Structure 1
Amino acid sequence: SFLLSKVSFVIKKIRLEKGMTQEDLAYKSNLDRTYISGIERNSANLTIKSLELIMKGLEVSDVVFFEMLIKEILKH
């Protein structure tokens, strides 16, 4: 899936840009490290509530996240 891969990519990109490991983001959001690893491989079951929490943890606003996402969708 095109959208799933781009969501996964943007979450990994923002996490790596904040210098956070998957563990770091998990600890900040009270999620497991394997949930973050999992979403970066396949974002199918990531919910909007979990994405809001992740965006909170990455200290990215929702608008910037979606701007980043539109950019990735359009690059393709």
Structure 2
Amino acid sequence: ESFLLSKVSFVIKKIRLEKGMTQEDLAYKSNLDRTYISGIERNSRNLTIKSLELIMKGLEVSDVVFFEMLIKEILKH
């Protein structure tokens, strides 16, 4: 569907695994539904900047380093 979305959803998962988190921890720490974290990674889903922020806080990661990894993923072949 959307170019950027699958990149965002890819990076959320990448970080989540890097930090040895599971989906449902992240769902807690991000103060969003269990199934939403799944749905974001699983398919992609069209999240909101506010929701993205919540997830970033949950990944225990800064806006900045998130976007830095986002850029790197976009740039790949």
Q: CA RMSD in A?
A: 1.2
Aligned to 1:38: 39
Following superposition, the deviation at residue 42 of structure 1 comes to: 3.7
| Unaligned ranges ≥5, structure 1 | none
Following superposition, the deviation at residue 55 of structure 1 comes to: 0.3
Runs (4+) of structure 1 exceeding 2 A deviation are 41-45
Following superposition, the deviation at residue 59 of structure 1 comes to: 1.1
Any conservation in 1 of the 2:31–2:54 contact (CA below 8 Å)? no
Specify the SS of the correspondent of 1:75: coil
| Unaligned ranges ≥5, structure 2 | none
Structure number with the higher helix fraction is 1
Distance (Å, rounded) in 2 between the aligned partners of 1:29 and 1:43: 17
Any conservation in 2 of the 1:4–1:42 contact (CA below 8 Å)? no
Distance (Å, rounded) in 2 between the aligned partners of 1:55 and 1:47: 12
Identity %: 99
TM-score of the aligned structures, taking structure 2 as reference length: 0.89
- Give the paired residue count: 76
